[PDB]
Amino acid sequence: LKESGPGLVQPSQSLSITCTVSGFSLTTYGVHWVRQSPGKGLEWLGVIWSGGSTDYNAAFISRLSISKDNSKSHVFFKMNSLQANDTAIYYCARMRITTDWFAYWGQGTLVTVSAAKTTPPSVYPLAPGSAAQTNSMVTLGCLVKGYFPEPVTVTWNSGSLSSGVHTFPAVLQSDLYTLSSSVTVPSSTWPSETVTCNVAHPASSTKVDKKIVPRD
Amino acid sequence: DILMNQTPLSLPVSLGDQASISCRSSQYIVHRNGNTYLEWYLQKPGQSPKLLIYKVSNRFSGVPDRFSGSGSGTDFTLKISRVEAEDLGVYYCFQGSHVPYTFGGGTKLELKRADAAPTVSIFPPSSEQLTSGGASVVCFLNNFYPKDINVKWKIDGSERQNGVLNSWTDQDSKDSTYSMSSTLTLTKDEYERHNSYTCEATHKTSTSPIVKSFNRNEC
Numbered sequence: 182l183k184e185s186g187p188g189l190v191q192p193s194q195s196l197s198i199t200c201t202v203s204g205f206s207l208t209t210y211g212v213h214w215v216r217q218s219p220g221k222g223l224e225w226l227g228v229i230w231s232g233g234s235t236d237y238n239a240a241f242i243s244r245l246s247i248s249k250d251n252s253k254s255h256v257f258f259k260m261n262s263l264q265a266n267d268t269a270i271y272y273c274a275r276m277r278i279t280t281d282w283f284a285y286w287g288q289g290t291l292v293t294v295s296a297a298k299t300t301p302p303s304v305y306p307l308a309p310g311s312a313a314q315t316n317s318m319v320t321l322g323c324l325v326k327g328y329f330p331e332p333v334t335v336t337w338n339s340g341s342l343s344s345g346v347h348t349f350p351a352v353l354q355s356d357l358y359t360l361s362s363s364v365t366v367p368s369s370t371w372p373s374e375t376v377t378c379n380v381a382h383p384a385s386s387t388k389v390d391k392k393i394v395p396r397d
Numbered sequence: 398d399i400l401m402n403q404t405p406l407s408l409p410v411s412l413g414d415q416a417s418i419s420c421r422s423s424q425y426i427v428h429r430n431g432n433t434y435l436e437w438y439l440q441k442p443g444q445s446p447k448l449l450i451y452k453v454s455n456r457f458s459g460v461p462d463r464f465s466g467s468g469s470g471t472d473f474t475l476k477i478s479r480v481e482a483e484d485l486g487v488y489y490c491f492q493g494s495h496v497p498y499t500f501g502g503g504t505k506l507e508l509k510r511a512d513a514a515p516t517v518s519i520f521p522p523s524s525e526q527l528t529s530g531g532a533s534v535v536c537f538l539n540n541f542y543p544k545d546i547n548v549k550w551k552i553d554g555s556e557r558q559n560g561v562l563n564s565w566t567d568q569d570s571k572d573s574t575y576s577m578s579s580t581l582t583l584t585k586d587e588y589e590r591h592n593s594y595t596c597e598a599t600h601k602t603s604t605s606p607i608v609k610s611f612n613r614n615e616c
């Protein structure tokens with residue numbers, strides 16, 4: 182099952198995904214649609230049956246249509262009035278299975294709902310507070326805030342500090358992505374030696390380096 | 398609308414353990430044309446869900462003997478006789494009996510390990526950020542186990558909820574721990590109306606909460 186659709190739709194607008202089926206006939210089998218929101222479990226949206234009728238999840242029935250073309254083996258997912266919380270991976274699938282052969286899923290189509298223009302991140306270095314205690318290990322941070330779209334690349338001293346890094350999944354709020362990165366190093370290496378956050382954002386072709394300096 | 402309740406939510410296991418996941422429906426999962434449509438799906442990170450069991454008890458093609466399914470009516474159970482590392486992921490049941498069809502909430506199968514307290518680090522807003530008219534306070538809670546944890550922000554002795562965004566990693570494939578970042582974002586002006594900022598973490602490893610804080614005064 183091959184899917185095609187837009188990675189990006191704007192809030193009030195519509196979303197169409199195409200699912201091209203092969204190996205079985207749509208005259209024989211239903212095709213279902215499922216999605217997964219970023220923090221969340223799988224959710225069933227609807228089905229188009231072999232006979233051409235449809236059923237839907239009641240939270241979506243008023244703004245969702247599944248349609249098909251039996252001759253070209255296409256199934257279409259059309260949904261209106263998208264909102265930021267419709268950002269998800271959308272799958273087409275065979276389900277309600279009766280036998281092993283023909284139980285395929287699509288790859289999934291990532292759909293992101295946002296009004297924002299391509300926007301580079303504000304990168305902020307995070308040194309510890311002035312009174313924070315020092316042990317063998319000191320933790321520093323990087324805040325990559327207000328960017329669009331995904332992804333960004335966060336390295337520390339150009340990759341050399343890989344071990345000891347945590348980079349956290351970005352979360353989407355008010356049309357923009359924000360993420361966080363922490364690196365943990367021996368107190369004998371900072372602030373004595375320089376530690377730097379390197380942030381790359383391919384979509385805006387920006388590359389930004391940000392030294393972690395103590396607050397004086 | 399049929400509610401599917403999976404339990405437990407989280408199942409820690411050591412490799413080689415027997416494991417049982419339970420799925421209870423709010424209505425009888427009745428047959429359709431002689432078929433009882435109860436199915437189990439596994440999702441590993443970065444991948445599509447994949448069918449394991451269909452029609453309640455039938456192993457799908459390419460699915461090992463160690464996986465079995467049983468049950469009827471409103472009680473169903475997936476069993477793994479001896480857990481391998483390839484089985485770690487989230488398991489979802491699905492019912493195809495009653496429209497609209499519904500998944501359970503999922504059960505996360507995870508690797509058991511020795512308890513580990515979070516390393517908590519708190520960070521005042523960057524100066525560079527205050528210049529733009531925003532202020533974000535950031536707390537890291539790194540390398541803890543088990544996954545169960547509560548994070549509470551306190552400003553001047555008051556629990557604060559608005560402006561808080563959380564984000565977590567899945568289980569680390571090196572050390573089997575979890576990490577988390579919590580980020581309280583306010584306007585510059587609201588941030589300046591206060592002094593004591595605190596990130597409080599409740600976790601199994603500590604009888605009383607792990608606390609880190611600063612005074613804006615000092616930075």
Ligand SMILES: *[C@@H]1O[C@H](CO)[C@@H](O)[C@H](O)[C@H]1NC(C)=O
Binds near residue numbers: 264265266
């Ligand atoms: C999603 O957000 C929209 C827009 O604010 C709102 O109408 C809707 O109730 C929300 N639904 C869910 C499930 O979060």
Ligand SMILES: [Ca+2]
Binds near residue numbers: 234235236
């Ligand atoms: Ca119907």
